[PDB]
Amino acid sequence: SDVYCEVCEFLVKEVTKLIDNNKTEKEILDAFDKMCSKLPKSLSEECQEVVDTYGSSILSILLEEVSPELVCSMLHLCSGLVPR
Numbered sequence: 001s002d003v004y005c006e007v008c009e010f011l012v013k014e015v016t017k018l019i020d021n022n023k024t025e026k027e028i029l030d031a032f033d034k035m036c037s038k039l040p041k042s043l044s045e046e047c048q049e050v051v052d053t054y055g056s057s058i059l060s061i062l063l064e065e066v067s068p069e070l071v072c073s074m075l076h077l078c079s080g081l082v083p084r
Contacts, residue, residue: 007047008072010039011058016068028059050077 014035018028032055036047050058054075061071072078 002078003043003046004050005072005078007039007043007050008054008058008075008077009069011035011047011051012062012068012071014038015059015062019062025059025063029055 015028018031023031032051036044036051039047054077057075058071061074062068066074073080
């Protein structure tokens with residue numbers, strides 16, 4: 001029930017549609033001011049920390065033609081079945 005993975009995939013899904021609608025980098029960071037405004041209040045906070053701490057980094061990887069789901073896996077924000 002790691003609420004962090006759910007939010008990283010939500011920002012990625014919302015950001016790629018923004019990349020698909022032809023918006024500039026400056027606009028994606030501008031909307032980050034009303035984007036957490038689309039999730040119930042129960043996830044408000046965990047998004048502020050993800051967006052504010054992992055905002056330039058998430059948005060920076062997406063431009064390196066890397067798959068959107070590889071983002072939450074590379075930022076170690078979604079660990080795996082750590083066998084050790």
